[PDB]
Design a protein around this ligand. Structure first.
Ligand SMILES: CCCCCCCCO[C@@H]1O[C@H](CO)[C@@H](O)[C@H](O)[C@H]1O
Ligand SMILES: CCCCCCCCO[C@@H]1O[C@H](CO)[C@@H](O)[C@H](O)[C@H]1O
Length: 326
């Protein structure tokens, strides 16, 4: 067991191994310097991790997910620790990740640079989707970059509905992984134009802006709508055609416009997948089909289980104890 030290910050007493130095507020998160690896890190102290069944299952879910993620373009876990010497004492969980400089909200980009950023998102997304994980909330604030434009997908703001797929915003009961490809389309459009593609002021406005670009749903899509009231609402909309994307993204690389046309499709079954998108000619200078890895199988069967707090806590403790650093 390493040597721990205690200090007060954020009106809580953080107790961490001495390897982690100069903690400064940025659960809650402190930036730190790890003397063992020499890395700048983010240390997240989970808030009330076992206060209820719901908190405890969320704590387990977060740790399990971070432990699985092992890809250059996805945030991974550098360390997980607790001051507790036993299950009986186990009340606090701290997660350590790479400290990222900035997010994509912070950063006109050149076409070469827009290719590089979107390539990396899709490379990461290929990996996440291969594990049968759906992100659901991809947006510029969940995309971290360093000075060298190297990008990682974050689970949460750091470890707005402008970027959400329309089926999520409309409460669909079933989801494609391609909800995330919609989000990538929105992000790419914004990197091209400098402005938010669909800056809806509320859910009605958001949907109006979307349909203005992509057109109202066609008969092929209406065939797959089980909700009677949904179909009726959709067909009572004033009808409108798909816009020509070239006339929206004036001066963009034609290959960028083509890829956007393939991402920003209302019918999720007709959207390009992350794997397919990596092979699109827009990324020719970056694409390497032998260096776009996939993930080990990820067991989410726990999501279907209903357990007691102590049970979720013991499972989380097991995952802390079994952690092996990268
Ligand atoms: C007018 C606004 C309505 C939004 C329509 C969103 C349609 C999304 O597309 C739908 O996604 C589903 C879930 O992945 C699939 O089961 C359907 O087959 C597919 O057509
Ligand atoms: C004018 C706005 C039209 C949006 C329709 C919103 C209602 C969508 O309702 C959803 O429809 C899905 C498709 O059948 C179902 O999977 C979901 O269970 C249902 O919640």
């Amino acid at each position: 067991r390493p040597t721990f030290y205690r200090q007060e910050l954020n009106k809580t007493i953080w107790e961490v191994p001495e390897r982690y130095q100069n903690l400064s507020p940025v659960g809650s998160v402190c930036a730190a310097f790890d003397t063992k690896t020499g890395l700048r890190v983010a240390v997240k102290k989970l808030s009330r991790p076992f206060q209820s069944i719901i908190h405890a299952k969320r704590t387990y879910r977060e740790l399990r997910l971070l432990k699985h993620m092992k890809h250059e373009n996805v945030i991974g876990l550098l360390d997980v620790f607790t001051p507790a010497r036993s299950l009986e004492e186990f009340n606090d969980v701290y997660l350590v990740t790479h400290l990222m400089g900035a997010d994509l909200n912070n950063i006109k980009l050149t076409d070469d640079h827009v290719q590089f950023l979107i390539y990396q998102i899709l490379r990461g997304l290929k990996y996440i989707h291969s594990a049968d994980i759906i992100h659901r909330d991809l947006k510029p604030s969940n995309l971290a970059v360093n000075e060298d434009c190297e990008l990682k997908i974050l689970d949460f703001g750091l470890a707005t509905r402008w970027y959400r797929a329309p089926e999520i915003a409309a409460n669909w009961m079933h989801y494609n992984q391609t909800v995330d490809i919609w989000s990538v389309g929105c992000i790419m459009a914004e990197l091209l134009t400098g402005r938010t593609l669909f800056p809806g002021t509320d859910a009605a406005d958001q949907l109006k802006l979307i349909l203005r670009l992509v057109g109202t749903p066609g008969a092929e899509l209406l065939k797959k709508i089980s909700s009677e009231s949904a179909r009726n609402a959709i067909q009572s909309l004033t009808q409108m055609p798909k816009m020509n994307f070239a006339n929206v993204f004036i001066g963009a690389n034609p290959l960028a416009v083509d890829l956007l046309e393939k991402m920003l499709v209302l019918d999720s079954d007709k959207r390009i997948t992350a794997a397919q998108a990596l092979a699109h000619a827009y990324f020719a200078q970056y694409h390497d089909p032998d260096d776009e890895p996939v993930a080990d199988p990820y067991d989410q069967s726990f999501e279907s289980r209903d357990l007691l707090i102590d049970e979720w806590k013991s499972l989380t403790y097991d995952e802390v104890i079994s952690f092996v650093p990268p």
